[PDB]
Amino acid sequence: MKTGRIVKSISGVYQVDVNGERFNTKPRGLFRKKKFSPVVGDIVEFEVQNINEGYIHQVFERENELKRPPVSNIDTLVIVMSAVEPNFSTQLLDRFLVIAHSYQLNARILVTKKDKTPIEKQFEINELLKIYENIGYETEFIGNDDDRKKIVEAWPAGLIVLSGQSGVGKSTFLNHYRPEHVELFERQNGYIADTPGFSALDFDHIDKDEIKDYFLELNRYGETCKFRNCNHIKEPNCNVKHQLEIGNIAQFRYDHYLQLFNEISNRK
Numbered sequence: 508m509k510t511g512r513i514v515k516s517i518s519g520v521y522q523v524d525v526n527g528e529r530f531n532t533k534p535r536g537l538f539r540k541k542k543f544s545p546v547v548g549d550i551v552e553f554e555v556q557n558i559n560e561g562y563i564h565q566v567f568e569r570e571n572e573l574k575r576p577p578v579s580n581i582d583t584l585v586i587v588m589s590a591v592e593p594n595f596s597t598q599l600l601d602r603f604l605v606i607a608h609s610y611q612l613n614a615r616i617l618v619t620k621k622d623k624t625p626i627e628k629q630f631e632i633n634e635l636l637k638i639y640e641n642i643g644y645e646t647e648f649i650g651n652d653d654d655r656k657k658i659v660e661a662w663p664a665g666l667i668v669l670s671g672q673s674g675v676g677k678s679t680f681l682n683h684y685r686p687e688h689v690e691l692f693e694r695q696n697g698y699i700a701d702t703p704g705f706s707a708l709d710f711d712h713i714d715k716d717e718i719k720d721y722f723l724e725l726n727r728y729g730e731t732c733k734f735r736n737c738n739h740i741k742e743p744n745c746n747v748k749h750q751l752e753i754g755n756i757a758q759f760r761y762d763h764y765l766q767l768f769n770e771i772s773n774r775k
């Protein structure tokens with residue numbers, strides 16, 4: 508009996524990594540049904556057969572998961588944004604953060620293409636990134652003069668998934684891990700996923716009421732709003748509006764919250 512992570516799902520066979528060693532397995536029990544089907548990222552217990560094969564007996568309860576692509580137990584969602592081509596957008600970033608937190612994921616922020624960003628713009632982006640650091644995120648701003656493999660290995664242990672639009676620079680990182688459905692590649696201290704989590708933006712699962720939970724500073728300062736479910740829009744005695752007023756929440760963050768709050772409700 509062995510325990511490990513699914514790094515590949517190929518026509519119903521599940522490659523499980525156990526500290527480097529690969530085993531090709533098939534589900535048994537409940538796990539043969541679509542409704543309980545294993546997914547890449549799952550931690551499983553399997554019985555070994557035929558030296559490098561096995562039967563999955565148990566799939567451990569998922570800590571989190573994405574549906575498209577289907578991938579589970581992500582330890583850090585790295586949101587990849589370009590500084591230029593296309594221009595850095597707090598509007599897009601904030602949205603990608605809302606999605607990440609709606610899936611219960613640890614997020615961090617990676618801005619790319621520093622080498623081709625005008626230096627005055629670099630300075631403006633660094634200030635913006637400091638706001639995100641204030642909220643609690645780790646941020647990096649990198650370009651072609653940086654060692655992308657040192658960057659990745661210094662990230663937290665476990666499963667990293669990159670998320671961002673085509674063109675931001677994800678493959679440039681991933682090509683460092685390629686043996687050369689989502690597939691996970693090995694890194695020292697974990698894995699990194701071959702597909703992004705959410706190149707695009709899907710809010711369908713999100714209720715207007717949850718949006719404040721996913722703006723972390725609003726959630727935190729919302730603690731001392733008079734109303735326990737204050738949405739920080741028209742309510743009296745609102746600590747988010749107070750903190751906004753005395754400069755402890757950025758106006759753009761509040762503006763984006765409002766926009767999303769109003770947008771989210773609407774019909775598609």
Ligand SMILES: Nc1nc2c(ncn2[C@@H]2O[C@H](COP(=O)(O)OP(=O)(O)O)[C@@H](OP(=O)(O)OP(=O)(O)O)[C@H]2O)c(=O)[nH]1
Pocket residue numbers: 619620621622623649650651671672673674675676677678679680
């Ligand atoms: N200057 C600079 N460019 C970056 C950086 N990161 C990524 N790029 C470039 O941006 C483009 C998209 O990168 P990918 O790595 O393919 O992005 P993706 O997977 O998110 O879609 C590529 O350029 P391309 O269209 O292939 O043209 P070229 O730049 O290869 O000449 C890539 O080389 C960076 O940090 N600095």
Ligand SMILES: [Zn+2]
Pocket residue numbers: 729732733737738739740742744745746747748
């Ligand atoms: Zn409030």
